[PDB]
Amino acid sequence: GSSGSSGPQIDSSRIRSHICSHPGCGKTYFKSSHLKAHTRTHTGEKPFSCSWKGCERRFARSDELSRHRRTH
Ligand SMILES: [Zn+2]
Ligand SMILES: [Zn+2]
């Protein structure tokens, strides 16, 4: 038997050495450091967090944050 795990075809031509250890992810980065910053999204509930004066509102997706930090 077999299944369809193809997924999205969204990608950008760029240099990427440090490969993500986590399986399936399939995400590599050039900046040896980037990786470290990436894993963050894997560990924990939400990597991004507003942390404003009196907001205390976090988010999982990036765009979500930026879109939320617009009304502030
Ligand atoms: Zn990953
Ligand atoms: Zn906020």
PDB file of C-alpha atoms and ligand atoms in Angstrom:
ATOM      1  CA  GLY A   1       0.000   0.000   0.000  1.00  0.00           C
ATOM      2  CA  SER A   2       0.883   3.689  -0.153  1.00  0.00           C
ATOM      3  CA  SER A   3      -0.314   7.183   0.757  1.00  0.00           C
ATOM      4  CA  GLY A   4      -0.038  10.784  -0.397  1.00  0.00           C
ATOM      5  CA  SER A   5       2.249  12.896   1.776  1.00  0.00           C
ATOM      6  CA  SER A   6       3.448  15.137  -1.053  1.00  0.00           C
ATOM      7  CA  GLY A   7       2.162  18.255   0.676  1.00  0.00           C
ATOM      8  CA  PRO A   8       2.591  21.874  -0.470  1.00  0.00           C
ATOM      9  CA  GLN A   9       4.961  22.734  -3.318  1.00  0.00           C
ATOM     10  CA  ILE A  10       5.842  26.123  -1.835  1.00  0.00           C
ATOM     11  CA  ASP A  11       9.615  26.589  -1.840  1.00  0.00           C
ATOM     12  CA  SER A  12      12.258  29.259  -2.436  1.00  0.00           C
ATOM     13  CA  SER A  13      15.579  28.713  -4.209  1.00  0.00           C
ATOM     14  CA  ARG A  14      18.231  29.497  -1.599  1.00  0.00           C
ATOM     15  CA  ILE A  15      21.300  28.075   0.143  1.00  0.00           C
ATOM     16  CA  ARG A  16      20.558  25.754   3.061  1.00  0.00           C
ATOM     17  CA  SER A  17      23.101  23.555   4.843  1.00  0.00           C
ATOM     18  CA  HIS A  18      21.875  22.923   8.388  1.00  0.00           C
ATOM     19  CA  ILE A  19      19.139  20.330   7.881  1.00  0.00           C
ATOM     20  CA  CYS A  20      16.257  19.931  10.331  1.00  0.00           C
ATOM     21  CA  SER A  21      16.748  16.806  12.443  1.00  0.00           C
ATOM     22  CA  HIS A  22      12.995  16.409  12.922  1.00  0.00           C
ATOM     23  CA  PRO A  23      11.571  14.008  10.304  1.00  0.00           C
ATOM     24  CA  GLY A  24       8.932  15.050   7.787  1.00  0.00           C
ATOM     25  CA  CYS A  25       9.704  18.717   8.390  1.00  0.00           C
ATOM     26  CA  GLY A  26      12.217  18.753   5.550  1.00  0.00           C
ATOM     27  CA  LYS A  27      13.450  22.275   6.246  1.00  0.00           C
ATOM     28  CA  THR A  28      17.066  23.371   5.812  1.00  0.00           C
ATOM     29  CA  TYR A  29      18.807  26.700   6.406  1.00  0.00           C
ATOM     30  CA  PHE A  30      22.117  28.285   5.404  1.00  0.00           C
ATOM     31  CA  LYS A  31      22.845  30.218   8.597  1.00  0.00           C
ATOM     32  CA  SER A  32      24.205  27.483  10.866  1.00  0.00           C
ATOM     33  CA  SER A  33      22.473  29.527  13.568  1.00  0.00           C
ATOM     34  CA  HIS A  34      19.062  29.746  11.900  1.00  0.00           C
ATOM     35  CA  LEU A  35      18.536  26.037  12.569  1.00  0.00           C
ATOM     36  CA  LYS A  36      18.839  26.616  16.316  1.00  0.00           C
ATOM     37  CA  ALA A  37      16.204  29.341  16.006  1.00  0.00           C
ATOM     38  CA  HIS A  38      14.012  27.042  13.913  1.00  0.00           C
ATOM     39  CA  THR A  39      13.943  24.098  16.322  1.00  0.00           C
ATOM     40  CA  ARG A  40      12.234  26.596  18.625  1.00  0.00           C
ATOM     41  CA  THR A  41       9.018  26.243  16.624  1.00  0.00           C
ATOM     42  CA  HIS A  42       9.245  22.493  17.211  1.00  0.00           C
ATOM     43  CA  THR A  43       9.787  22.668  20.973  1.00  0.00           C
ATOM     44  CA  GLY A  44       6.970  24.342  22.880  1.00  0.00           C
ATOM     45  CA  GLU A  45       3.445  25.475  22.042  1.00  0.00           C
ATOM     46  CA  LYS A  46       4.124  28.840  20.404  1.00  0.00           C
ATOM     47  CA  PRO A  47       7.587  30.121  19.398  1.00  0.00           C
ATOM     48  CA  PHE A  48       6.380  33.686  18.851  1.00  0.00           C
ATOM     49  CA  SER A  49       4.961  35.816  21.665  1.00  0.00           C
ATOM     50  CA  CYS A  50       3.800  39.437  21.695  1.00  0.00           C
ATOM     51  CA  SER A  51       4.994  40.137  25.238  1.00  0.00           C
ATOM     52  CA  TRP A  52       3.687  43.707  25.133  1.00  0.00           C
ATOM     53  CA  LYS A  53       3.081  46.109  28.019  1.00  0.00           C
ATOM     54  CA  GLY A  54      -0.211  44.490  28.981  1.00  0.00           C
ATOM     55  CA  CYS A  55      -1.051  42.181  26.087  1.00  0.00           C
ATOM     56  CA  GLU A  56       0.236  38.709  26.962  1.00  0.00           C
ATOM     57  CA  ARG A  57      -0.932  37.340  23.610  1.00  0.00           C
ATOM     58  CA  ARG A  58       1.167  34.708  21.843  1.00  0.00           C
ATOM     59  CA  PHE A  59       0.826  33.116  18.403  1.00  0.00           C
ATOM     60  CA  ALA A  60       1.968  30.046  16.472  1.00  0.00           C
ATOM     61  CA  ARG A  61       2.178  31.553  12.986  1.00  0.00           C
ATOM     62  CA  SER A  62       4.412  34.515  12.142  1.00  0.00           C
ATOM     63  CA  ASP A  63       2.043  36.462   9.891  1.00  0.00           C
ATOM     64  CA  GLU A  64      -0.500  36.174  12.704  1.00  0.00           C
ATOM     65  CA  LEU A  65       1.805  38.121  15.023  1.00  0.00           C
ATOM     66  CA  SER A  66       2.708  40.875  12.559  1.00  0.00           C
ATOM     67  CA  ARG A  67      -0.979  41.189  11.677  1.00  0.00           C
ATOM     68  CA  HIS A  68      -1.720  41.471  15.398  1.00  0.00           C
ATOM     69  CA  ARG A  69       1.109  43.911  16.121  1.00  0.00           C
ATOM     70  CA  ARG A  70      -0.480  46.299  13.623  1.00  0.00           C
ATOM     71  CA  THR A  71      -3.382  47.496  15.772  1.00  0.00           C
ATOM     72  CA  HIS A  72      -1.078  48.010  18.755  1.00  0.00           C
TER      73      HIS A  72
HETATM   74 ZN    ZN B   1      11.908  21.441  11.472  1.00  0.00          ZN
HETATM   75 ZN    ZN B   2      -0.163  42.133  21.379  1.00  0.00          ZN
END
